[PDB]
Design a binder for this molecule. Sequence first.
Ligand SMILES: [Mg+2]
Ligand SMILES: [Mg+2]
Ligand SMILES: [Mg+2]
Ligand SMILES: [Mg+2]
Ligand SMILES: [Mg+2]
Ligand SMILES: [Mg+2]
Ligand SMILES: [Mg+2]
Ligand SMILES: [Mg+2]
Ligand SMILES: [Mg+2]
Ligand SMILES: [Mg+2]
Ligand SMILES: [Mg+2]
Ligand SMILES: [Mg+2]
Ligand SMILES: [Mg+2]
Lengths: 104, 54, 131, 88, 95
Amino acid sequence: VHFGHQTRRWNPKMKKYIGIYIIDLQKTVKKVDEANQRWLGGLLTNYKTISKRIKRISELKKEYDRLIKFLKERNAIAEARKLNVGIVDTNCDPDEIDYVIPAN
Amino acid sequence: THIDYKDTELLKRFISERGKILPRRVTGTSAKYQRMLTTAIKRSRHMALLPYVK
Amino acid sequence: TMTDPIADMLTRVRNANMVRHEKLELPASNIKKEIAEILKSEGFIKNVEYVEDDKQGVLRLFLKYGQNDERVITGLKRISKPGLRVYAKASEMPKVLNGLGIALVSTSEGVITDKEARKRNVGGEIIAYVW
Amino acid sequence: AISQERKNEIIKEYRVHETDTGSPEVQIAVLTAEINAVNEHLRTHKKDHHSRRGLLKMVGRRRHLLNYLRSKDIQRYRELIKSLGIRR
Amino acid sequence: MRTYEVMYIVRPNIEEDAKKALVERFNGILATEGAEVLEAKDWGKRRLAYEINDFKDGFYNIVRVKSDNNKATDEFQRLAKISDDIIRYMVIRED
RNA sequence: AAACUUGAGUGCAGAAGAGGAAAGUGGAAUUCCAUGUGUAGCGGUGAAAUGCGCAGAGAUAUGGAGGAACACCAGUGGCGAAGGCGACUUUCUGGUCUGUAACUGACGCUGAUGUGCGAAAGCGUGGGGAUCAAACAGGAUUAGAUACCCUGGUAGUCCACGCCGUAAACGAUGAGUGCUAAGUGUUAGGGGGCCCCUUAGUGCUGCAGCUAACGCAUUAAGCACUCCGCCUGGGGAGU
RNA sequence: GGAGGUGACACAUGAUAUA
RNA sequence: UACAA
Ligand SMILES: [Mg+2]
Ligand SMILES: [Mg+2]
Ligand SMILES: [Mg+2]
Ligand SMILES: [Mg+2]
Ligand SMILES: [Mg+2]
Ligand SMILES: [Mg+2]
Ligand SMILES: [Mg+2]
Ligand SMILES: [Mg+2]
Ligand SMILES: [Mg+2]
Ligand SMILES: [Mg+2]
Ligand SMILES: [Mg+2]
Ligand SMILES: [Mg+2]
Ligand SMILES: [Mg+2]
């Protein structure tokens, strides 16, 4: 859980956390103490609308089959980073993680 | 090594079936080698060691 | 070629500060050493080290950032220039950022700040504003 | 324009001390031989503008070295002026 | 100061005993004015890759020269041009 | 006034290059000419016609003359200040890059005026004249067609020597110097163990920053200092 | 997938403001 | 629409 992505794509901000690059296992352990489907656009920023679908899911079969299945993560961070913890590989941006775990 | 225009056997390997100089992306030669190759082949064509168009 | 070694120093700080580097090295000179110490004394930078070498010396500066990685130095500006030198009197010493910043002045009692230049009643060449 | 053998002859004659190759006297003397040789080339190659541009750079570099030598020690400067066929 | 690698082709229908008359002479021309010949060679009959002067073969000859004036090889090139025995030639600065 | 070696030059050791000037050598093709075979069209367009051809064309084969240009190599490859530079050979000659740290010791940067170089067209004198081709002629098209298309064709296109001094002469981005994430091609080198590091070029992508936006982004349009050139609504008018 | 290089018959016209 | 023809 400490072998990151290839060198030809490693973000420069993971140099402290980092052939291929190997993660900082020693630093992740100290960081770990400090700390499945598509993410709908506006899951957090549009709860005034999603909750209606969440409520309508609780309350047709064609909708529910996709609704149950529903209710890489750049959409989610913006929904949270704009509101003012997560595994952060070398290719991922660390500057936008409050509790970054530098483990693969 | 420096390519000699007299060495027709080495040069024939880099010409095609019509006597055209082969591109280096086909033969895998490097850029500086292909430049030396081209001068030697043109020298050898002039001395009738290699054909212009066969 | 290089015409203003002081403005080159102020710009090296500005560029390193922009990307939040911890430290920077630049070739040394007497006035650059004294400018750096005033920035240390005024609390804009962390530390200054002098590294001797055969050519002209090296100055190592250590930059300062507060909580939430906020920059202590907000801006640097060269005032006196080789193309147009700027001098001031003690009675017309400029205040930088209404006193929240400093002006570096080369006076006949050395290189000092603007608040001290008015205290000593000396004027001189306005080197730079730091805020 | 000039061979390494001819250049080393000039360096030996005009050097201000042994193991000196960078003094103005050595540089001006070598530049003078190079300028004369390209002028010889340009007498039968009048249309060689590209070479003539390089000669103009040598003339400018020689003039700058002469100005530096003149302003630093006029005695060395005036002795070098006669040694070569140089006016000013 | 310089080394050259003169090559020339003699026409194939020449009389045999007349060939040494020019090769000795053309090498002789390639030695005047401080032009010590380093080496002479004589390739055999070769099939020319194309017809030169409606010929199919020739006597390839390689002469290596050591001069510092190149007027020796200039004399060779002047003479080879107007001589109908030699049908193709080339001078090459080896180094 | 005196020191210094980092800037700038020199020396030494390597390397790459369509950098330039002059003179030679060569292969393909076009045109013309001759000769042999050989007979009814060839050529050309959207369709045609003008045109050439039975006096032997066109086609084919061989030979000759002449001028011009150099397939393949050939590559956001290389060189040059820019304009530009592409067959090969020799001669003369300019610049750049890498390494080294002998040497000099700030000798630097920029640059008004000035002085030079400067695509193509054009001009003068004299040569040359294959191809192409302003003008021009004929044939088409069209309501007309002073065009676009076709068949020809002069200047010119080529050379030498003078002149001209202009281009979307463009990266529409002046020069110099330093500083500021990364990734990835490529050209010429160097160091160390095919890879890692490092110089100098040349491309793409992309942060910070900048921008009106487009975009630029260590080859800045970012952050700074020096010098030069230039702008101040459109037209009139670059008159 | 997106760029940069490379190469590749005939059809005329429609006044001013206000829209 | 008010015009122009
Ligand atoms: Mg060398
Ligand atoms: Mg070089
Ligand atoms: Mg200048
Ligand atoms: Mg001017
Ligand atoms: Mg012209
Ligand atoms: Mg026409
Ligand atoms: Mg003419
Ligand atoms: Mg001319
Ligand atoms: Mg302009
Ligand atoms: Mg600039
Ligand atoms: Mg810059
Ligand atoms: Mg970009
Ligand atoms: Mg680069």
